[PDB]
């Protein structure tokens, strides 16, 4: 019942669940680096006391909202049931805040901010909420 | 500062030059991802047969004579049971050789057909076929789990045509996954089938409309590529044919000589030898005069014109190498006149490597030259006031 | 003794010698000399096809056009090397733009013609797609020029046969057919029109041509074209646009020949130019109409039927081994603001005094001339309403047998 252009391509998806290619944690699944169609990307697999309901709420939001300040759903596969996202080149905010904390120039905070800001806009108006920000 | 200010200069990645006078009729790609990133050539400089293996990482050429006749077009099957991997033939005589792509010595041929083979094309559709075109349009449809025997033969041998209409132009649909019809083309007509093996739509496209254009229009089908519609290309036409998959009528007719008229200023034999096209983005026509056009694939709209680098484009594929894909292997004929004005054989066959992201960077580019140029105009200004 | 000459590699030196060396045209003429004395060796074809001497008598043809030897060489040498990797999946554009080149420029020279069809012949006996190329390259002028030409001039029954055997060949496709119709209809060559309309070729071919007819009246073309043409299949509405036409550029032979069809019964000798809105009448324009019998049917054009039977035998070779003066003039829809032409006397007044009837209702006529109503003896009924009189003319009353004056 989703667009045609949203369905893994097994064939294309060089992917390895380890601990060295883990890129953080989920509400319910864990996320590593993966390759597909030749390009890094981040595949969301969940846990094993899941169900399809997760996925869906998951693609209730990114499967039919689009915006520059959402990330962006590249492949949702069905028979391992994972996701298949964007990579975000600088990572988290997190690692910013703790680690890094000698780039975040006044600028850098007012754009962080107002990206989340005109996200959560988006998010709102479109009768969805997040919840955990 | 213009030959920096160029996208062709950014997206060719590699080039190779083939040993001293080679001429390599078709090409195809060890792809497995993972395994090993090379090519395979089918050598034509010989009327003999001849596979020639291209090792990228090294650079490193291989030949092996190994056909009696030229081979015309190759084609790569993985049995993904016991991780098997062959390569298939198609010589000018009929033959259908199977080598391994590992193994070295597990030569065996197939069923001889009746005259020259013309496309290999292999595609799954579930089950894996490996289609075999012969010249004569007949469509010898073979099964890919019955390749480790050593001689065989065609599940369903479909007839398309007759020995004078020739069957060269076999094809796929990668749009919404729809891998059920697969758009091919026999003589001067465009024919469809699926997994039932019936023909849905057999279209006669030697006759012309207009009329005026119908010396080029009235020529063999060479390529076809299908996203939304239908692209049809022939011999020595510089016209491409934009057809309706639903009301089987021409909707465009592109000219290549009006988008090479701004360059060649600067008989147009600018034929279109091959035809590549790219996901979403743009198409890729490669033309018998060393030009390559990239086309808009929105409406109309020409990206850029890339020349100086061939006389020839011969072979326009895309491949992945290295886990790093998004690759255009272009293989040209460069013909240094140095030899004679008589077109003495003095023929660099070059494959070149580009990078399919290169309609962007063309766009990226001159915003970038705009932006500066602004930036400079504003910067005298303050300096004049 | 051949086969140690053949060994001692002379192909390969001769070669070398007339391709790297293209000047000097006299090792030209010398090394075509040698090559075909080279060809009918046993073991010449291979070690020919080998060392690509095909692309070398090419070339050599290209940079020598006006020279007779060099092209009747050629010519002759093309079709005894010629195989089926030279013409492989349909391939040979830069073969047949030599040879209509060198068939066009040297048409008279009865040896270059026979070579250049032979070699025509041994090419199309290779691969049948290769007459569409030549119909491309515009192989019609030689051949039209040519079957014209040899049963004008002096009769040679072998070379006839040979360009009719070419011709079967090129005209197995009916588009092929269409092609060579339209483009003899561009010319005016009804010699062989009527050929082609006897092997096929429908004249309703409308691809922006619209009407054959048409188009080959706005070209001033010949009166037996167009006969042609309205013999064979054509649609009325064709012919009636082919009658506006000739009406704007005023012909009288085309307007007579289109009104033949358009209006004219002989099985009830009537005619019935009724609602084609002709602006005017003359007399030459319908003059032809009346029968004449004293000009009799003459049947000297029998060359288009010998052609199209010789034609038609190689294809199926082919195929198996592998008084009533006529009375009822009517003009009544016609736009007619005066028939004062009718008055004057022409070949008209020779066929009026037996007319016994004559409609000219629905028109614009007036004051209805009084010559024309006393040529006419045996007008006995005359109807002539909705036009603008404004007077009875009076007389009318004084022709001979006049009954249903309307
Ligand atoms: N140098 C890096 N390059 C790429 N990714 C990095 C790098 N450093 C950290 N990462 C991690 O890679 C991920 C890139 O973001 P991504 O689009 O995959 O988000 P996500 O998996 O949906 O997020 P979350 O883990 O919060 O659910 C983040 O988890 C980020 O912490």
């Not at chain 3, 109409?289 to 000009?295: E, G, H, I, R």
Request: proline content about 2%; some cysteine.
């Amino acid at each position: 019942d989703l667009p045609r252009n949203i369905m893994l391509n097994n064939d294309e998806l060089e992917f390895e669940q380890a601990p060295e290619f883990l890129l953080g944690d989920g509400s319910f699944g864990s996320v590593y680096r993966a390759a597909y169609e030749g390009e890094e990307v981040a595949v969301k697999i969940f846990n094993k006391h899941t169900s399809l309901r997760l996925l869906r709420q998951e693609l209730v939001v990114l499967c039919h909202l689009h915006h520059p300040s959402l990330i962006s759903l590249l492949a949702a596969g069905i028979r391992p049931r994972m996701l298949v996202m964007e990579l975000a080149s600088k990572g988290s905010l997190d690692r910013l805040l703790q680690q890094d904390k000698a780039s975040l120039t006044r600028t850098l905070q007012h754009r962080i901010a107002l990206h989340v800001a005109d996200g959560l806009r988006y998010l709102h108006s479109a009768m969805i909420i997040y919840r955990d920000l | 500062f213009d030959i920096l200010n160029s996208a062709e200069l950014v997206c060719l990645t590699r080039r190779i030059l083939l040993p001293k006078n080679v001429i390599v009729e078709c090409m195809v790609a060890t792809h497995h991802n993972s395994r090993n990133a090379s090519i395979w050539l089918g050598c034509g400089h010989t009327d003999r047969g001849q596979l020639s293996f291209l090792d990228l990482n090294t650079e490193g050429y291989t030949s092996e004579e190994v056909a009696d006749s030229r081979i015309l077009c190759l084609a790569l099957v993985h049995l993904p049971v016991e991780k098997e991997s062959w390569i298939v033939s198609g010589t000018q005589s009929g033959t259908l050789l199977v080598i391994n792509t590992e193994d070295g010595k597990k030569r065996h041929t197939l069923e001889k057909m009746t005259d020259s083979v013309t496309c290999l094309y292999c595609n799954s559709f579930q089950k894996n076929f490996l289609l075999v075109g012969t010249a004569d349009g007949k469509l010898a449809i073979f099964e890919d789990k019955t390749v480790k025997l050593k001689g065989a033969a065609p599940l369903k041998i479909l007839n398309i045509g007759n020995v004078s209409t020739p069957l060269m132009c076999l094809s796929e649909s990668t749009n919404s996954t729809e891998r059920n019809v697969m758009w091919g083309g026999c003589g001067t007509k465009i024919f469809s089938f699926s997994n039932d093996f019936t023909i849905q739509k057999l279209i006669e496209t030697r006759t012309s409309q207009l009329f005026s254009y119908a010396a080029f229009s009235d020529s063999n089908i060479i390529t076809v590529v299908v996203d939304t519609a239908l692209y049809i290309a022939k011999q020595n036409s510089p016209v491409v044919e934009v057809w309706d998959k639903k009301t089987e009528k021409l909707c465009g007719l592109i000219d290549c000589v009006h988008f090479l008229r701004e360059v060649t200023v600067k008989s147009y034999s600018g034929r279109v030898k091959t035809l590549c096209l790219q996901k979403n983005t743009a198409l890729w026509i490669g033309t018998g005069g060393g030009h390559i056009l990239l086309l808009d694939l929105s409406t109309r709209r020409l990206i850029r014109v890339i020349y100086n680098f061939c006389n020839s484009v011969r072979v326009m594929m895309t491949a992945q190498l290295g886990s790093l894909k998004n690759v255009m292997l272009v293989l040209g004929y460069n013909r240094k006149n140095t030899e004679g004005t008589q077109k003495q054989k003095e023929i660099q066959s070059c494959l070149t490597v580009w990078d399919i992201n290169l309609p962007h960077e063309v766009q990226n580019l001159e915003k970038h030259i705009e932006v500066r140029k602004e930036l400079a105009e504003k910067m005298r200004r303050t300096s004049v006031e | 003794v051949k086969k140690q000459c053949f060994k001692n590699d002379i192909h390969k030196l001769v070669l070398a010698a007339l391709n790297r060396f293209i000047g000097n045209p006299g090792i030209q003429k010398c090394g075509l000399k040698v090559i075909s004395s080279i060809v009918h060796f046993p073991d010449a074809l291979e070690m020919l096809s080998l060392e690509g001497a095909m692309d070398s008598v090419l070339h050599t043809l290209q940079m020598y056009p006006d020279d007779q030897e060099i092209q009747c060489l050629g010519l002759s040498l093309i079709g005894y090397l010629i195989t089926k990797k030279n013409v492989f999946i349909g391939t040979g554009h830069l073969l047949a733009k030599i040879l209509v080149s060198s068939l066009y420029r040297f048409k008279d020279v009865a040896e270059i013609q026979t070579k250049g069809f032979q070699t025509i012949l041994a090419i199309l006996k290779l691969s049948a797609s290769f007459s569409k190329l030549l119909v491309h390259h515009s192989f019609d002028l030689v051949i039209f020029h040519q079957m014209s030409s040899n049963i004008m001039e002096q009769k040679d029954q072998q070379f006839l046969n040979l360009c009719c055997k070419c011709f079967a060949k090129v005209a197995m496709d009916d588009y092929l057919k269409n092609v060579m119709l339209e483009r003899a209809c561009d010319q005016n060559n009804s010699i062989m029109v009527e050929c082609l309309l006897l092997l096929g070729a429908d004249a309703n071919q409308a691809k922006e041509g619209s009407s054959l007819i048409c188009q080959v009246c706005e070209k001033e073309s010949s009166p037996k074209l167009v006969e042609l043409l309205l013999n064979s299949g054509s649609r009325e509405q064709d012919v009636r646009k082919a009658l506006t036409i000739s009406i704007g550029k005023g012909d009288s032979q085309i307007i007579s020949l289109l009104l033949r069809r358009l209006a004219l019964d002989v099985a009830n000798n009537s005619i019935c130019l009724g609602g084609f809105c002709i602006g005017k009448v003359e007399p030459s324009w319908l003059g032809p109409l009346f029968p004449d019998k004293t000009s009799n049917l003459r049947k000297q054009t029998n060359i288009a039927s010998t052609l199209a039977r010789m034609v038609i035998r190689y294809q199926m070779k082919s195929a198996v081994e592998e008084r009533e003066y006529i009375t009822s003039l009517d003009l009544s829809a016609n736009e007619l603001r005066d028939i004062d032409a009718l008055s004057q006397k022409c070949c008209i007044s020779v066929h009026l005094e037996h007319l016994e009837k004559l409609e000219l209702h629905q028109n614009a006529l007036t004051s209805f001339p009084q010559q024309l109503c006393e040529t006419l003896k045996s007008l006995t009924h005359l109807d002539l309403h909705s036009n603008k009189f404004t007077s009875f003319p009076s007389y009318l009353l004084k022709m001979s047998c006049i009954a249903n004056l309307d």
